[PDB]
PDB file of C-alpha atoms and ligand atoms in Angstrom:
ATOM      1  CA  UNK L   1      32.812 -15.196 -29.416  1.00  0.00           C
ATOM      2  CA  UNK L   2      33.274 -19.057 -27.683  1.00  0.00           C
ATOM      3  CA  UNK L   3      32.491 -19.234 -24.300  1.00  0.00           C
ATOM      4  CA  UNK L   4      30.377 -16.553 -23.870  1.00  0.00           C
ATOM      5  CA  UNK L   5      27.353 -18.587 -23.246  1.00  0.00           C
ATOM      6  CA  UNK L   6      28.989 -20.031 -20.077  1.00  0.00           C
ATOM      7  CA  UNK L   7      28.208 -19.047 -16.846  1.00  0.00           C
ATOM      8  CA  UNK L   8      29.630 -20.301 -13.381  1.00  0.00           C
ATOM      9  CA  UNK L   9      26.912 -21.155 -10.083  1.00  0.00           C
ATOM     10  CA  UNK L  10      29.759 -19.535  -7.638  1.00  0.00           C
ATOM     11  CA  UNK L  11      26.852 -19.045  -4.549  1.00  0.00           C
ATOM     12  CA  UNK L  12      23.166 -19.402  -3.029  1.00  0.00           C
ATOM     13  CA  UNK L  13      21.801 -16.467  -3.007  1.00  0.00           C
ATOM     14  CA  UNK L  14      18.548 -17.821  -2.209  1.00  0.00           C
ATOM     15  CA  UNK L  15      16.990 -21.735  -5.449  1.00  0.00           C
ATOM     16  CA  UNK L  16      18.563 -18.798  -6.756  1.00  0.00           C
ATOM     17  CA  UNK L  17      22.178 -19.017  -7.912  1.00  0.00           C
ATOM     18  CA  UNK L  18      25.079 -15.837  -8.154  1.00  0.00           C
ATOM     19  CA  UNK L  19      26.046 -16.822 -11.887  1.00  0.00           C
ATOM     20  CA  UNK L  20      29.443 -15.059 -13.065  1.00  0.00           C
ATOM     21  CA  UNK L  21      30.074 -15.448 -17.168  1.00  0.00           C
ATOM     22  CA  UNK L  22      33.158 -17.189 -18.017  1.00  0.00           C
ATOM     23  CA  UNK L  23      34.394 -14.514 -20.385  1.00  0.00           C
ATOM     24  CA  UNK L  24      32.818 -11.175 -19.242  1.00  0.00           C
ATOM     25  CA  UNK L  25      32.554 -11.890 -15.508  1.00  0.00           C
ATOM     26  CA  UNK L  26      28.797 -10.424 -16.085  1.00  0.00           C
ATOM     27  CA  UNK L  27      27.121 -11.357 -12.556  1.00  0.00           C
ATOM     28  CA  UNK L  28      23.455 -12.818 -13.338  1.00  0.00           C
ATOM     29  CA  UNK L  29      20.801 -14.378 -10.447  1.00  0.00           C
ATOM     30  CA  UNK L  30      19.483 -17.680 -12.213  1.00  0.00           C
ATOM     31  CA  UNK L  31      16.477 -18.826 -10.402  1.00  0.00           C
ATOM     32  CA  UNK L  32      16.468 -22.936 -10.787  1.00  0.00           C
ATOM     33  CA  UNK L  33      13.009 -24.904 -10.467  1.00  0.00           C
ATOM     34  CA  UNK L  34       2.751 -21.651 -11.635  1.00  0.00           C
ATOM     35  CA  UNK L  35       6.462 -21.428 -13.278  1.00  0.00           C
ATOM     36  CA  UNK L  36       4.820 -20.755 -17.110  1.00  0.00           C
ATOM     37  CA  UNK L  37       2.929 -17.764 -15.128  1.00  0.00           C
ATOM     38  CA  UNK L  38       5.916 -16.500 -13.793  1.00  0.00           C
ATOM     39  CA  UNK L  39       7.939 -16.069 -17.136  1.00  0.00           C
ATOM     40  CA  UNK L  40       4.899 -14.875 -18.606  1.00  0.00           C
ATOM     41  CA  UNK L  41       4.539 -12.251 -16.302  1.00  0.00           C
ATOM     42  CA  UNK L  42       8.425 -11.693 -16.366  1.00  0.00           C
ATOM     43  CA  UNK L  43       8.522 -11.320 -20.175  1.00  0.00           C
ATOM     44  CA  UNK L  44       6.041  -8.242 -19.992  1.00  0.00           C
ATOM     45  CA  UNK L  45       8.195  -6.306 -17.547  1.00  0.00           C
ATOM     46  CA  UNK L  46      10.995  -3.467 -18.227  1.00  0.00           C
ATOM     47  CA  UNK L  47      11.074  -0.742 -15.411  1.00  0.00           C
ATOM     48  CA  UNK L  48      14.186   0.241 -12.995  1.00  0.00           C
ATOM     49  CA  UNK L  49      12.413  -0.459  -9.900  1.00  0.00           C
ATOM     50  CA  UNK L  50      11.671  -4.050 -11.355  1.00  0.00           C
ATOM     51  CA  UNK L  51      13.946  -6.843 -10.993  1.00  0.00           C
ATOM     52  CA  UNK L  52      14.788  -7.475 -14.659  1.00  0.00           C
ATOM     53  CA  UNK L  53      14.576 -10.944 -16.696  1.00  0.00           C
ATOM     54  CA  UNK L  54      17.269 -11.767 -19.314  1.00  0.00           C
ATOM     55  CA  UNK L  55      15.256 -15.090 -20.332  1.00  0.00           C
ATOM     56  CA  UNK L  56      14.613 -18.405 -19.718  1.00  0.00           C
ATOM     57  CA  UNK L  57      16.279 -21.999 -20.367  1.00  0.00           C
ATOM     58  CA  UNK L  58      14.453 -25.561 -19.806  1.00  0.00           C
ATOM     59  CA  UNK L  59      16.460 -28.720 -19.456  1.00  0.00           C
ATOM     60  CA  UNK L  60      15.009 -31.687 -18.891  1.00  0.00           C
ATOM     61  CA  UNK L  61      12.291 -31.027 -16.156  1.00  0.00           C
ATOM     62  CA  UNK L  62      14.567 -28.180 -14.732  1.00  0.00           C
ATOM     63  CA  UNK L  63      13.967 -24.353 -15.779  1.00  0.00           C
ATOM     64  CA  UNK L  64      16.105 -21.307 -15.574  1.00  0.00           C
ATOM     65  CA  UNK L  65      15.449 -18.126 -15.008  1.00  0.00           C
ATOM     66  CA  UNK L  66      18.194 -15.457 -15.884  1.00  0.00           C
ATOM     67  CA  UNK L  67      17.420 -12.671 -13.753  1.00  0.00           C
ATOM     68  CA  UNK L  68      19.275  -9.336 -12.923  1.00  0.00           C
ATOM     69  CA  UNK L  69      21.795  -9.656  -9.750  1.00  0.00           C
ATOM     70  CA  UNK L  70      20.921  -7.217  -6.446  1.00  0.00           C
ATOM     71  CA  UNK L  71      24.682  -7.159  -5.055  1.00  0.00           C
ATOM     72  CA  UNK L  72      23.001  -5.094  -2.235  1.00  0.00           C
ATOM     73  CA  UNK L  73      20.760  -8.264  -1.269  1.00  0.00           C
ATOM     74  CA  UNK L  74      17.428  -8.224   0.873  1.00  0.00           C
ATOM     75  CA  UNK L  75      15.921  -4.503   1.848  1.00  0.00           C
ATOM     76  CA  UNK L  76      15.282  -6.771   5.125  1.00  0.00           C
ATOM     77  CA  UNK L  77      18.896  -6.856   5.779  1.00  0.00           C
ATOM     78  CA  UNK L  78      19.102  -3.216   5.993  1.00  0.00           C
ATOM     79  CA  UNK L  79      16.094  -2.917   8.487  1.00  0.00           C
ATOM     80  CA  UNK L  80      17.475  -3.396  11.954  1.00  0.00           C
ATOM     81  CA  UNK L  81      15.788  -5.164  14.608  1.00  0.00           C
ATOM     82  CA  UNK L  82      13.388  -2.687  17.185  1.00  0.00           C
ATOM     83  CA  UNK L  83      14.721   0.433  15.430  1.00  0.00           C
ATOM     84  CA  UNK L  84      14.246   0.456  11.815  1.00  0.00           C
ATOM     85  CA  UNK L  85      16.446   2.597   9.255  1.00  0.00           C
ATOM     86  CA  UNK L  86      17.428   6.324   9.242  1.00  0.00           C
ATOM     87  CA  UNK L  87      13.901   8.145   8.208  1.00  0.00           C
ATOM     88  CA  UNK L  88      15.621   9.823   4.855  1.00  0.00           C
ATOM     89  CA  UNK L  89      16.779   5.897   3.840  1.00  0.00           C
ATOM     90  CA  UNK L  90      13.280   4.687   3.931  1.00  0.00           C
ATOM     91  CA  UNK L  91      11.267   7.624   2.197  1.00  0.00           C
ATOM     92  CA  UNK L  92      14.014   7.237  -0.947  1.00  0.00           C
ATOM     93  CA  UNK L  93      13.398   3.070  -0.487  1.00  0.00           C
ATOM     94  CA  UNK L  94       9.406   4.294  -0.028  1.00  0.00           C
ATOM     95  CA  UNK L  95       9.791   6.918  -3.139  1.00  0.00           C
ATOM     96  CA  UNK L  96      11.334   3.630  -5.415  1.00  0.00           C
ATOM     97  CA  UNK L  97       9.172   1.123  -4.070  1.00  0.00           C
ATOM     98  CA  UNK L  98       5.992   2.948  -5.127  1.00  0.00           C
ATOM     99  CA  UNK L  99       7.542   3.997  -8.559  1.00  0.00           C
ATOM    100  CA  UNK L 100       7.568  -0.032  -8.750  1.00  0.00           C
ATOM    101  CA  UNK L 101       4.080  -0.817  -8.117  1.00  0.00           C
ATOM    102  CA  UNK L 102       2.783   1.960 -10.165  1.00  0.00           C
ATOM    103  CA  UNK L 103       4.556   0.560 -13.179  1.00  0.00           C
ATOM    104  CA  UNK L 104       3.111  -2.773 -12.690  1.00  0.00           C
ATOM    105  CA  UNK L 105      -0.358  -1.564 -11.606  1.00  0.00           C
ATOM    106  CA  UNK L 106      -0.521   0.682 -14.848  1.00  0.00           C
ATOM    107  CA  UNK L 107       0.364  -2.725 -16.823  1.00  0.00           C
ATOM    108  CA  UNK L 108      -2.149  -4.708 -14.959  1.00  0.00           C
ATOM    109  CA  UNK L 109      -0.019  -6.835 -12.513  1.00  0.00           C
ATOM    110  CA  UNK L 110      -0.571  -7.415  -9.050  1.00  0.00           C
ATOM    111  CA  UNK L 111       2.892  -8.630  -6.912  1.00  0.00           C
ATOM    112  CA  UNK L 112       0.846 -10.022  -4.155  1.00  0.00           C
ATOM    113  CA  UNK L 113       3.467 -10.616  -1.795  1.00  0.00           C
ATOM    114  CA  UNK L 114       5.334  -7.311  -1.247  1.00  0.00           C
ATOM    115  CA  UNK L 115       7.437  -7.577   1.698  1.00  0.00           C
ATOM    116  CA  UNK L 116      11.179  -6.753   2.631  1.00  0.00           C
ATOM    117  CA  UNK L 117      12.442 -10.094   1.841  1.00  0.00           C
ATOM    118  CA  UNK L 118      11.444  -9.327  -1.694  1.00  0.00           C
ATOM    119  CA  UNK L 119      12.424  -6.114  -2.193  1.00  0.00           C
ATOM    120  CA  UNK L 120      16.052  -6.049  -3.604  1.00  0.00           C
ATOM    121  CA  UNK L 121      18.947  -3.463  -3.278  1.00  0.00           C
ATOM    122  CA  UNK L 122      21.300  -2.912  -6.450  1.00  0.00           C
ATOM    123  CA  UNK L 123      24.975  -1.650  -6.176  1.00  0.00           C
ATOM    124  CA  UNK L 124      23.749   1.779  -5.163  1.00  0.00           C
ATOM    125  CA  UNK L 125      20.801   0.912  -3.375  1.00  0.00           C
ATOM    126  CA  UNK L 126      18.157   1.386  -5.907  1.00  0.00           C
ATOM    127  CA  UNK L 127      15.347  -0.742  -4.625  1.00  0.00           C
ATOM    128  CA  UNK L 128      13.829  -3.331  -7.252  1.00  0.00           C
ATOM    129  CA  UNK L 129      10.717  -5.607  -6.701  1.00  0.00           C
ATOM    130  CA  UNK L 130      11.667  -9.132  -6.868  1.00  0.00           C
ATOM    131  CA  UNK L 131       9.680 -12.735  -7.073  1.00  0.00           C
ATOM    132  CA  UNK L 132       6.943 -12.776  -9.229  1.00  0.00           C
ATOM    133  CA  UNK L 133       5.569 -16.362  -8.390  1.00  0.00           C
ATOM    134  CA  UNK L 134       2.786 -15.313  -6.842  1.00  0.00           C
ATOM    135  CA  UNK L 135       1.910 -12.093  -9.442  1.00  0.00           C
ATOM    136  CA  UNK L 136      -1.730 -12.029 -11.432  1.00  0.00           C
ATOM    137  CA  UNK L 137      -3.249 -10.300 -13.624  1.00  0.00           C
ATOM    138  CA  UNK L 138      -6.005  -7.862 -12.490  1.00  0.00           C
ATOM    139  CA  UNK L 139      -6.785  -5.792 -15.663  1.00  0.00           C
ATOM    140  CA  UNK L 140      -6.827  -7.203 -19.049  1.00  0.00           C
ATOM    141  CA  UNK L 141      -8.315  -5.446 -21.966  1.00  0.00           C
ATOM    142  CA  UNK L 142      -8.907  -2.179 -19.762  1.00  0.00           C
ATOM    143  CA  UNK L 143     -11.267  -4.426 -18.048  1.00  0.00           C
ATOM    144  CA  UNK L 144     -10.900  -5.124 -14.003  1.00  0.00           C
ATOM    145  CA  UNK L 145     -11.014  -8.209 -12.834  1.00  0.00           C
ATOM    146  CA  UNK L 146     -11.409  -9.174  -8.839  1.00  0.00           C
ATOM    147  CA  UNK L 147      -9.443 -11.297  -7.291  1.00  0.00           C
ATOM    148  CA  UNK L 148     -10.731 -13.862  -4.614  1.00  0.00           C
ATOM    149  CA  UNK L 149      -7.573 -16.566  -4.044  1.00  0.00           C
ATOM    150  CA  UNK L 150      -5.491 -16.107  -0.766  1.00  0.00           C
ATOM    151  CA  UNK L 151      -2.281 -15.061  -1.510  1.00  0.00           C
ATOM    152  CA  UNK L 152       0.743 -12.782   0.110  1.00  0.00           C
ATOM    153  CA  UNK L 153       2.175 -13.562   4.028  1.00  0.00           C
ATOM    154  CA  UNK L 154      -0.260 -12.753   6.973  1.00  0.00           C
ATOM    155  CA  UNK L 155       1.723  -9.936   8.625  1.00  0.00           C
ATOM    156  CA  UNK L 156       1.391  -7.915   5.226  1.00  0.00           C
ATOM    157  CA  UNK L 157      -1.654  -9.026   3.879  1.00  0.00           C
ATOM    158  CA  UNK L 158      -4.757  -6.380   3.711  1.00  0.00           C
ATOM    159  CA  UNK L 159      -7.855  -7.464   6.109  1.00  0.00           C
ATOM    160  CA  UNK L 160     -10.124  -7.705   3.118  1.00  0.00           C
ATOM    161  CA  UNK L 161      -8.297 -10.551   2.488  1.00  0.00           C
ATOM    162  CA  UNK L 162      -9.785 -12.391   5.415  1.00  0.00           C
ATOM    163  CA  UNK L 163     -13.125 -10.705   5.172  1.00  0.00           C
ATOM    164  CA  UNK L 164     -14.323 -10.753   1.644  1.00  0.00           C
ATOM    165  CA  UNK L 165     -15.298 -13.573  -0.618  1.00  0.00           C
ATOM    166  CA  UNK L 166     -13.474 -11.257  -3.499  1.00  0.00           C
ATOM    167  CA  UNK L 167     -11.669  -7.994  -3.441  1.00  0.00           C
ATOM    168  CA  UNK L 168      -9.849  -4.927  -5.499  1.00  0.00           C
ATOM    169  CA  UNK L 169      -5.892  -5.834  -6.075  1.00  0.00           C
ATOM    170  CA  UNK L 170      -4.295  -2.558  -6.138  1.00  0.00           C
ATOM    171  CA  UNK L 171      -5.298  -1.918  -2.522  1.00  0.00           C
ATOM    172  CA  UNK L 172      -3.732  -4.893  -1.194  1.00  0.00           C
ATOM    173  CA  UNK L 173      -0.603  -3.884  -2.399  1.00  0.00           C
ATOM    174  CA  UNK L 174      -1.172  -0.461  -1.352  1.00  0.00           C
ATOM    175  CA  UNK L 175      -2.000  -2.058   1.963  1.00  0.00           C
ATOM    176  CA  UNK L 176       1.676  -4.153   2.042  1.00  0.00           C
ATOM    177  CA  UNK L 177       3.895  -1.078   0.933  1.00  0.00           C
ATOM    178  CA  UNK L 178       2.119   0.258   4.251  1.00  0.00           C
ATOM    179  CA  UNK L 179       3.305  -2.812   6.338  1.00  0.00           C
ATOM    180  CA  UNK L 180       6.831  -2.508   4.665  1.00  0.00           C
ATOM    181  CA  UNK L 181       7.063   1.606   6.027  1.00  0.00           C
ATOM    182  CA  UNK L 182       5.960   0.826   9.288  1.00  0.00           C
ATOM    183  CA  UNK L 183       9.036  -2.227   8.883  1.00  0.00           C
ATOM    184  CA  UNK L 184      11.773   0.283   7.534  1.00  0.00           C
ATOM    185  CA  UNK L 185      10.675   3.408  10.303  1.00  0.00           C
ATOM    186  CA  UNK L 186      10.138   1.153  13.619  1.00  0.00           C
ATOM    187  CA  UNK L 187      12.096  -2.070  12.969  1.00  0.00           C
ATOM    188  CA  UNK L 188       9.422  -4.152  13.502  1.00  0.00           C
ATOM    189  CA  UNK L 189       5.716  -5.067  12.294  1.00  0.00           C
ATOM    190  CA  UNK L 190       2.417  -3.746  14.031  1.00  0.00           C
ATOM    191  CA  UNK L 191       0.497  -7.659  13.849  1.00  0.00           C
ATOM    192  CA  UNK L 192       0.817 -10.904  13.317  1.00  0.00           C
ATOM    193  CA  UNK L 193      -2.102 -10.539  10.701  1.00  0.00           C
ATOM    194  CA  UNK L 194      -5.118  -7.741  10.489  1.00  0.00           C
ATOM    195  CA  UNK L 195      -7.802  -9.445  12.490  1.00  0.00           C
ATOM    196  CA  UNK L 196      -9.978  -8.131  15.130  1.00  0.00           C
ATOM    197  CA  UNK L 197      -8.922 -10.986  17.602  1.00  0.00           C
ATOM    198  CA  UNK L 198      -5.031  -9.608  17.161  1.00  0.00           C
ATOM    199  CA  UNK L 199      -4.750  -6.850  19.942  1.00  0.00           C
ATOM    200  CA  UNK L 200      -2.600  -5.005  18.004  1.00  0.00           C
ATOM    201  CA  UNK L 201      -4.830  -4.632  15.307  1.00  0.00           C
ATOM    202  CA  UNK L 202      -7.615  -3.574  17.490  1.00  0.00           C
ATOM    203  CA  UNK L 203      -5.136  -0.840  19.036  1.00  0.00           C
ATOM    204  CA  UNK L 204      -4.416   0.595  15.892  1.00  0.00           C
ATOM    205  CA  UNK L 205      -8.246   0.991  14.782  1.00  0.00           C
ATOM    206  CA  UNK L 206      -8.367   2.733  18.400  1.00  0.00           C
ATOM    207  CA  UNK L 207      -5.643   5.053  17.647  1.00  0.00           C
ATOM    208  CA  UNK L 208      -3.864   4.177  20.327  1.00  0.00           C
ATOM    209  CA  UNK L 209      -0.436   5.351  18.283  1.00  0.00           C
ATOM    210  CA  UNK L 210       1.184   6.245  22.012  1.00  0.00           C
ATOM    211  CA  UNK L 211       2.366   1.957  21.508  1.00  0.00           C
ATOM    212  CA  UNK L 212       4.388   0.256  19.585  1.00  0.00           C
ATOM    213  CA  UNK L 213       5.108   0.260  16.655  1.00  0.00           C
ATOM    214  CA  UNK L 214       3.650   3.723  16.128  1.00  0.00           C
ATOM    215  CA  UNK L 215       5.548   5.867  19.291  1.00  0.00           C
ATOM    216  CA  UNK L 216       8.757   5.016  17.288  1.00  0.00           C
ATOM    217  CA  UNK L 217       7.391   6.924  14.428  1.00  0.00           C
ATOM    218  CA  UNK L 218       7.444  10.870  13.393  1.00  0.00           C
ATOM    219  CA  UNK L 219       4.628  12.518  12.896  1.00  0.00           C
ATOM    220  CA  UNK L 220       4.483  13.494   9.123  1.00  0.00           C
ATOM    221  CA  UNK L 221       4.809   9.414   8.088  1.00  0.00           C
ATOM    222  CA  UNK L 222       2.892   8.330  11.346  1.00  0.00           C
ATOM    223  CA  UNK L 223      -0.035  10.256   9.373  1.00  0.00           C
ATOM    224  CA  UNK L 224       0.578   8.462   6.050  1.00  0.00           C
ATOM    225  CA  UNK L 225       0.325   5.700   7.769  1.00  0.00           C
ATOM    226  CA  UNK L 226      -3.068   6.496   9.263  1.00  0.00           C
ATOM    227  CA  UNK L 227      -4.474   7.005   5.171  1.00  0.00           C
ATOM    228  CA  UNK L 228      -2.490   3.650   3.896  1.00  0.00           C
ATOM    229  CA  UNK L 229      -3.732   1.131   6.744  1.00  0.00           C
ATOM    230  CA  UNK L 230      -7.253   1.862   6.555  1.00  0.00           C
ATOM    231  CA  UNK L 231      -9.451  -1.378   6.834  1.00  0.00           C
ATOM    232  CA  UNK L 232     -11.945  -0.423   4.568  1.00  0.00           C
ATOM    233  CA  UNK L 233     -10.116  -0.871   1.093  1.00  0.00           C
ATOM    234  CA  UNK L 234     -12.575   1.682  -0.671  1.00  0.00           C
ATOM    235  CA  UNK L 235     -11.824   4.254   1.782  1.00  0.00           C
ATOM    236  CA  UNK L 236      -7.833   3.261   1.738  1.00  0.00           C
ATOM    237  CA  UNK L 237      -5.564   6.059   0.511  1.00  0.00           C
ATOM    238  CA  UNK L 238      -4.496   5.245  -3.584  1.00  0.00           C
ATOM    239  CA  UNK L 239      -1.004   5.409  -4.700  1.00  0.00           C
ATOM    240  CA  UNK L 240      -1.491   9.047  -6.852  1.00  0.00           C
ATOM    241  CA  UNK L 241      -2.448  10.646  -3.515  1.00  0.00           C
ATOM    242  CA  UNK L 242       0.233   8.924  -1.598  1.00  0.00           C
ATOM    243  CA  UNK L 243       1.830  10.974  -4.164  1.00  0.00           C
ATOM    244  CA  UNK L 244       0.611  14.234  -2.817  1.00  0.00           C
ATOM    245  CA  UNK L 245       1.015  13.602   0.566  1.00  0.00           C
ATOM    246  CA  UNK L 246       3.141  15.535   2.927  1.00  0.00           C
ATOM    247  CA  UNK L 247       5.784  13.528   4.244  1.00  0.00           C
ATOM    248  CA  UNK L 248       6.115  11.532   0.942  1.00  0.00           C
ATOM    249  CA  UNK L 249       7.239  15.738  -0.355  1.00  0.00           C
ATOM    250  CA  UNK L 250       8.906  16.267   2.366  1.00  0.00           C
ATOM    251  CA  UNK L 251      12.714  17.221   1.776  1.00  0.00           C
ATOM    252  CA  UNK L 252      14.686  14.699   4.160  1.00  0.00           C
ATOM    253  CA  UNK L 253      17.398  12.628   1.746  1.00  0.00           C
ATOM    254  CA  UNK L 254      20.964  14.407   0.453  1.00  0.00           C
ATOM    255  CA  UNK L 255      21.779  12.903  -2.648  1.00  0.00           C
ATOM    256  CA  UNK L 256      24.939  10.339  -3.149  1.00  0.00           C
ATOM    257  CA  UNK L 257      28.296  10.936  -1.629  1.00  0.00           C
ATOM    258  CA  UNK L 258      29.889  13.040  -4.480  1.00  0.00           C
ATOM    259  CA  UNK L 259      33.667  13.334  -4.799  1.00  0.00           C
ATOM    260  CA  UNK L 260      35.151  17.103  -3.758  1.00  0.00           C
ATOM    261  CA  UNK L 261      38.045  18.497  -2.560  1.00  0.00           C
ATOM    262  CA  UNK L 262      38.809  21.912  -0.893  1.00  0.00           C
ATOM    263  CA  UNK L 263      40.898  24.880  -1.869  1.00  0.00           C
TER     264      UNK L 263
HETATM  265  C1  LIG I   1      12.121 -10.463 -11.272  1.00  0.00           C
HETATM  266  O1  LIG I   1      11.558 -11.738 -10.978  1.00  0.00           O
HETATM  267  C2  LIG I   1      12.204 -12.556 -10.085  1.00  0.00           C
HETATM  268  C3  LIG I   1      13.393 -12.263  -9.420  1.00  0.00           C
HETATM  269  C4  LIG I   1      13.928 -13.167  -8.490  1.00  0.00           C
HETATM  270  C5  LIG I   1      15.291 -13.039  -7.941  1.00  0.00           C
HETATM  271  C6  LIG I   1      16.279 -12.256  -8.366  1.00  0.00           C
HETATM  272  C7  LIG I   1      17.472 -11.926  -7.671  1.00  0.00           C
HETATM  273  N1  LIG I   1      18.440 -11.096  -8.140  1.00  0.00           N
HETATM  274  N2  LIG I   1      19.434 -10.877  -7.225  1.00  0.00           N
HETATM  275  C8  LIG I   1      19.091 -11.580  -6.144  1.00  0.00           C
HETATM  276  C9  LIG I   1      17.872 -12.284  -6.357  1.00  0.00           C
HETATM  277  C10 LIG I   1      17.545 -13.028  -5.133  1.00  0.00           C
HETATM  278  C11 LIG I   1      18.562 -12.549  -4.140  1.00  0.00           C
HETATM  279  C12 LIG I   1      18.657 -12.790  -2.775  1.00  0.00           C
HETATM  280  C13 LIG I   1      19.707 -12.259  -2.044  1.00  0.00           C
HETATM  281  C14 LIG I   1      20.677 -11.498  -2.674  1.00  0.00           C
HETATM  282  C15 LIG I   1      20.593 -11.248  -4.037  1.00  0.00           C
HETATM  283  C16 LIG I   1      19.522 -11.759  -4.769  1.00  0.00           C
HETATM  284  C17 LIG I   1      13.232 -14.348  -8.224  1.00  0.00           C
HETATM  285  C18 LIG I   1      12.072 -14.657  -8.907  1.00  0.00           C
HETATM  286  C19 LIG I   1      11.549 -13.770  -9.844  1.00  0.00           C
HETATM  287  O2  LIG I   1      10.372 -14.043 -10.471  1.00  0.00           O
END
């Protein structure tokens, strides 16, 4: 079919381009340019809560990335300043957003930098984990391997982090989806990183969850909370018990508008 390969930049999305096809009016995100690891990691990918890659195209000392188009844009865009997101909204984004990392945990891969202005929002809101630039491998060959380089952005990054010469990856993410709750339910972030000479930090450890960020929060997730930002990483609450915990169950979220009429 001629001109199907051609594909118009119409805006910045991010640099990331909004490419529309000439003949099908597909919409694609091309990402235009550590970049070898990226693809790599890219090409092993295929889950719905995973922001998917088409392929890749180098010309010159330029490469492109095809990647699937979020028409919903940034989660942070639907996280409003001081108050957060309707509780049912962020337990279905929560409920997607951990279906994400287990997928890429179970194949090995660490995102590293989970945060809302990563997490992507398709045409109906399904949430899908986005830039994998700073993504490793931590298992290879059913064999662990620790991870010592400093990676991810301070307000989401685990303390270990900034303690230990090396460290576990799956709790760090763990740790971030945390960071990313308290975000969606309150509207704003607890610290400006997990250090014992951030107040903040040190309130939390105290319990003092009559402040803020924590007063702003219910209950059932305010206790979720209190197993997923847990400074020691050993002790830290792991994603199949997230599973089983109480609010995470908890019925909250109708399902899509459906069309109906009466009588
Ligand atoms: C899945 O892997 C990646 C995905 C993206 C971006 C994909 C993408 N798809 N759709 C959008 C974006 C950015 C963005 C920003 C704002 C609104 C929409 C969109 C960047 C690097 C990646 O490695």
């Amino acid at each position: 079919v001629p001109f199907v390969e051609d594909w118009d930049l119409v805006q910045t999305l991010g640099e990331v381009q909004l490419a529309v096809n000439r003949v099908t009016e597909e919409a694609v995100a091309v990402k235009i340019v550590n970049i070898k690891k990226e693809i790599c990691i890219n090409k092993m990918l295929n889950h719905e809560n995973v922001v998917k890659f088409y392929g890749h195209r180098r010309e010159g000392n330029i490469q492109y990335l095809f990647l699937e188009y979020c028409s919903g844009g940034e989660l942070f865009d639907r996280i409003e300043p001081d108050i957060g997101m309707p509780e049912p909204d962020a337990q279905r984004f929560f409920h997607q957003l951990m279906a994400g990392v287990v997928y890429l945990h179970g194949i090995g891969i660490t995102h590293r930098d989970i945060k809302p202005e990563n997490l992507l929002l398709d045409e109906r809101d399904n949430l899908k984990i986005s830039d994998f630039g700073l993504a490793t491998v931590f298992r290879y060959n059913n064999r662990e391997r620790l991870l010592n380089k400093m990676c991810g952005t301070l307000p989401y990054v685990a303390p270990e982090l900034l303690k230990r010469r090396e460290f576990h990856a799956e709790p760090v993410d763990v740790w971030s989806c945390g960071i990313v709750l308290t975000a969606m339910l309150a509207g704003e972030l607890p610290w400006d990183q997990p250090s014992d000479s951030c107040q903040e930090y040190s309130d939390w450890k105290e319990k003092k969850t009559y402040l803020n960020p924590w007063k702003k929060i219910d209950s059932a997730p305010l206790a979720l909370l209190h197993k997923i930002l847990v400074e020691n990483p050993s002790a830290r609450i792991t994603i199949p018990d997230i599973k089983k915990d109480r609010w995470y169950n908890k019925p909250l979220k109708k399902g899509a508008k459906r069309p109906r009429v009466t009588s």
